[PDB]
Structures are given as structure tokens and as C-alpha cells.
């Protein structure tokens, strides 16, 4: 129990006619958001979205706000530069995304590094696993690949990833031990939903679990009902917790022939529940 990752997600977007570009930044440690910046607010500053982070002085907040305030300035250029690079007018709304961060083992040491960009939902550039080379997605990203090779950016980044990213991740993990390094199992149950005179919907619930990683499945007489199960995207409840249901369409009376199988890192052993009338 110690595979943890700090993750920053940036989102810059132009608004021609109606507005300056917007910068929105969020920060995660695992599935738990802890920060938020928005350049579109009353004197933008980065703000806590977790409890263990409000313990940090205005030193953090000031440093972290300015970082974003400069990253904002940076992403306003990135929008105007990508205009040149893509031979595009000051007319369309275009979009930068960025994900940087670091996975870390249970020993607390660097395990993986991340940095990657995307113009309009297409991958644009991505620092590789070695934290020393790049991966441009088109000839326009190659302009940037050689800018940055000629600038030793892959060094500046590895430093942050191997140094500051990993050190602060361990800070965060420690300051919020119970909140971050804790996996709460789901509250599971089966409901019955007669869709006919004839057949019915058995739905299997998983409520209030953390983290988001879960594996619900339906099994009729001990076999994979994979093609015949309705699965919804794991969703947030609005309270650090998540949900997810699996649902299958069965006959009537044949209901105990089905079983729901829950796997979650909060559970000692996997679950197996059927419908209890």
C-alpha cells in the first residue's frame, strides 16, 4: 500500500470575439483533488480543495498562484503560437491540455514521470519514460521538439519530476495519511426491476468506495455475462466517494442463477452477492 501519484492537469482555451484566453488548473494526489486555479475569477489565486493542504502557509499559496499566473501567460502564447504552427486564424476557439506528474512506489521513490501536451484533443508532444527524449505527434510538434532539445527542457523537467514532484508528493501523503492512503470498500447491493410480466432487471450497486478503481461483473451459473451486462462509467458521488452499477436482464425465477462480483482494493476478499428478496 503505497503506489501513489501527484498529477497536475492544465487546460488553456481561447475565446475569440468574447474574452481573453482562460487558464484552469487542477491538481490531484491519486483520485483526490487538492488544488484549483482559474484565471477567469476575481484576482485569480490557487485554492485548497482538500483538508490537509490548508495547513500550508501563504508561502505555498503565493508561490503556487504566481506559478499559475505565469503559466497563464505562457498558455496565452501557446494559443497564439499554435495559430502560426497550424496556419489558423484568430477566429476559431482552440485548446491546450497538459498533464504532468509522478507515480511513486510504496518506498516513496520515483517510479514513473509524466509530461504531455494536446492541441484540440490530439496528442501534440509527450516527454518519454526516460525523462530525456520527446515524442512529437506531427511535423508541427517537431518544431517544438527541436526548440526544447536545443534548450535542455527534458533536463529542467526531470529535475522537477525526480526532485520537487516526489518530495512534495511525500509531504502530501504524510499530511493527509488517513485521507489519501486509505481505501474504503463499497456498500454493495442488488435491486430488482421487473421490465415485463416476464423478465426483470437485476442491478448491482457499488456505493461510496475509494479509490475509483473497481471491477463489477455479472455471472449466470458461474459464467462471464460480459456481452450481456450494462455497465455505467464509474461516477463521483460529490463527496470524495464514487459509484458504479452493473445491470443484467434476466428471466423470472432464474434470478438466483445470477451473481454479482465486486473487486475493490478496500475488500479483504472479492464479493459475491445475489438478489435477496
Amino acid at each position: 500500500m503505497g503506489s501513489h501519484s501527484m498529477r497536475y492537469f492544465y487546460t488553456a482555451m481561447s475565446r475569440p470575439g468574447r474574452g481573453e484566453p482562460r487558464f484552469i488548473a487542477v491538481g490531484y494526489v491519486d483520485d483526490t483533488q487538492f488544488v484549483r486555479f482559474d484565471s477567469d475569477a476575481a484576482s485569480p489565486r490557487t485554492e485548497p480543495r482538500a483538508p490537509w493542504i490548508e495547513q500550508e502557509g501563504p508561502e505555498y499559496w503565493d508561490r503556487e498562484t504566481q506559478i499559475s499566473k505565469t503559466n497563464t501567460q505562457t498558455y496565452r502564447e501557446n494559443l497564439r503560437i499554435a495559430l502560426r504552427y497550424y496556419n489558423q486564424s484568430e477566429a476559431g476557439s482552440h485548446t491546450w491540455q497538459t498533464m504532468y506528474g509522478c507515480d511513486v512506489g510504496p518506498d516513496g521513490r520515483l517510479l514513473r514521470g509524466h509530461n504531455q501536451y494536446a492541441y484540440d484533443g490530439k496528442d501534440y508532444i509527450a516527454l518519454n519514460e526516460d525523462l530525456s527524449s520527446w515524442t512529437a505527434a506531427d511535423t508541427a510538434a517537431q518544431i517544438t521538439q527541436r526548440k526544447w532539445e536545443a534548450a535542455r527542457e527534458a533536463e529542467q523537467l526531470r529535475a522537477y519530476l525526480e526532485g520537487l514532484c516526489v518530495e512534495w508528493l511525500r509531504r502530501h501523503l504524510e499530511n493527509g495519511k488517513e485521507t489519501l492512503q486509505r481505501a474504503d470498500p463499497p456498500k454493495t447491493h442488488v435491486t430488482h426491476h421487473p421490465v415485463s410480466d416476464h423478465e426483470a432487471t437485476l442491478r448491482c450497486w457499488a456505493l461510496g468506495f475509494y479509490p475509483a478503481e473497481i471491477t463489477l461483473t455479472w455471472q449466470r451459473d458461474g459464467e462471464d455475462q460480459t456481452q450481456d451486462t450494462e455497465l455505467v462509467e464509474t461516477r463521483p458521488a460529490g463527496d470524495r466517494t464514487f459509484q458504479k452499477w452493473a445491470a443484467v436482464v434476466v428471466p423470472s425465477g432464474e434470478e438466483q442463477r445470477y451473481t454479482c462480483h465486486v473487486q475493490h482494493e478496500g475488500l479483504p476478499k472479492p464479493l459475491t452477492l445475489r438478489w435477496e428478496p
Binding site: M6, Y8, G27, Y60, N71, I81, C165
Partner: peptide, 8 residues
């Protein structure tokens, strides 16, 4: 923590 990041 955030990061200051390059141009393009």
C-alpha cells in the same frame, strides 16, 4: 505542487 514550464 505546480510547475513553471517552457514556451513553445
Amino acid at each position: 505542487t505546480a510547475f513553471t514550464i517552457p514556451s513553445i
